[PDB]
Amino acid sequence: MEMEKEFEQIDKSGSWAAIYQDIRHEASDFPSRVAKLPKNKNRNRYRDVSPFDHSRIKLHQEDNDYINASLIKMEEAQRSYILTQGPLPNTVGHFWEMVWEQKSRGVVMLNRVMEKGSLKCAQYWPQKEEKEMIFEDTNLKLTLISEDIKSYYTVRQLELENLTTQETREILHFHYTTWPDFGVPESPASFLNFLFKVRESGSLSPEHGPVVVHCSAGIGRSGTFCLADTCLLLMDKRKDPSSVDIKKVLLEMRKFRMGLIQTADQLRFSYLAVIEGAKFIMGD
Ligand SMILES: Cc1cccc(Nc2ncnc3c2cnn3C)c1
Numbered sequence: 001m002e003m004e005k006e007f008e009q010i011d012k013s014g015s016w017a018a019i020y021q022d023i024r025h026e027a028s029d030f031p032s033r034v035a036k037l038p039k040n041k042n043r044n045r046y047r048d049v050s051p052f053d054h055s056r057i058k059l060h061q062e063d064n065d066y067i068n069a070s071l072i073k074m075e076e077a078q079r080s081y082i083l084t085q086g087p088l089p090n091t092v093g094h095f096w097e098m099v100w101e102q103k104s105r106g107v108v109m110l111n112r113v114m115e116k117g118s119l120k121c122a123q124y125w126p127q128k129e130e131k132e133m134i135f136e137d138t139n140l141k142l143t144l145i146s147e148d149i150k151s152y153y154t155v156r157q158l159e160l161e162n163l164t165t166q167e168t169r170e171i172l173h174f175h176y177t178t179w180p181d182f183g184v185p186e187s188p189a190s191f192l193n194f195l196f197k198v199r200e201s202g203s204l205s206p207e208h209g210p211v212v213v214h215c216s217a218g219i220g221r222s223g224t225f226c227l228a229d230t231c232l233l234l235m236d237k238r239k240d241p242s243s244v245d246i247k248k249v250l251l252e253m254r255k256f257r258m259g260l261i262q263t264a265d266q267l268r269f270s271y272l273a274v275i276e277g278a279k280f281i282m283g284d
């Protein structure tokens with residue numbers, strides 16, 4: 001079926017939970033043996049969210065190459081993404097090592113450091129220009145260059161220096177600051193505006209390594225971001241945009257990381273975002 005009318009048919013019939021459970025039943029199951037080794041227990045935030053072995057990102061290190069991060073490679077859309085958990089106190093150096101080694105231009109953050117009164121990820125970037133951060137375990141230096149605070153999101157320019165080679169690179173930090181502690185946003189308008197700002201920066205384009213995107217576990221809000229982006233790109237590329245099937249795209253992405261889209265409310269929000277986004281692209 002088309003998307004917008006499949007949407008109203010699920011609303012009127014109140015069957016979002018059944019649709020979402022079907023997706024969960026059909027989703028791929030691949031091994032995640034490296035994630036479960038005892039030496040990696042303090043590298044995982046949640047015991048039930050792990051990268052598959054076949055798609056995990058490997059650190060260029062001979063001691064321990066593990067990070068909780070996955071490469072989502074979308075062949076028809078010609079887009080790749082790295083989805084990862086929010087960094088932990090003992091993995092902030094690994095996080096920036098990955099950014100460096102994978103040649104990423106941008107980092108997309110969809111959570112606040114504290115939500116619901118608890119810490120959802122480490123404070124992994126500097127908050128003042130004159131107070132830079134050094135990660136001694138991976139030999140990197142990170143400096144805040146500039147910050148632009150807007151009503152729904154903040155963009156930061158960061159400098160990452162490999163202290164071994166003295167090479168430097170500019171990284172863009174796109175921080176969506178207004179996702180509610182509970183539920184999903186009422187309108188997709190600010191989330192779509194944010195997605196378009198990431199696109200306009202070059203961070204999603206083939207001349208760079210894959211964008212790094214995270215929330216707390218790296219599957220819920222993060223899944224919504226890449227699902228909406230890929231569906232909108234396919235609607236631009238194909239002769240028949242109504243042929244784009246969001247459930248099929250989501251199942252393809254779940255071949256590469258488990259659990260993407262965590263609730264039936266997040267599934268409905270993803271439909272809403274793609275539907276509204278397709279009107280703004282055109283040709284409008
Ligand atoms: C606040 C912020 C966030 C992200 C990127 C940038 N970059 C720039 N922002 C404004 N003017 C700029 C540049 C680079 N060159 N020039 C001339 C700034």
Ligand SMILES: Cc1cccc(Nc2ncnc3c2cnn3C)c1
Pocket residue numbers: 155172200201202
């Ligand atoms: C926030 C951000 C990140 C990355 C790229 C950009 N690009 C620009 N955004 C706005 N005006 C711009 C440019 C480049 N030239 N000029 C004149 C902005």
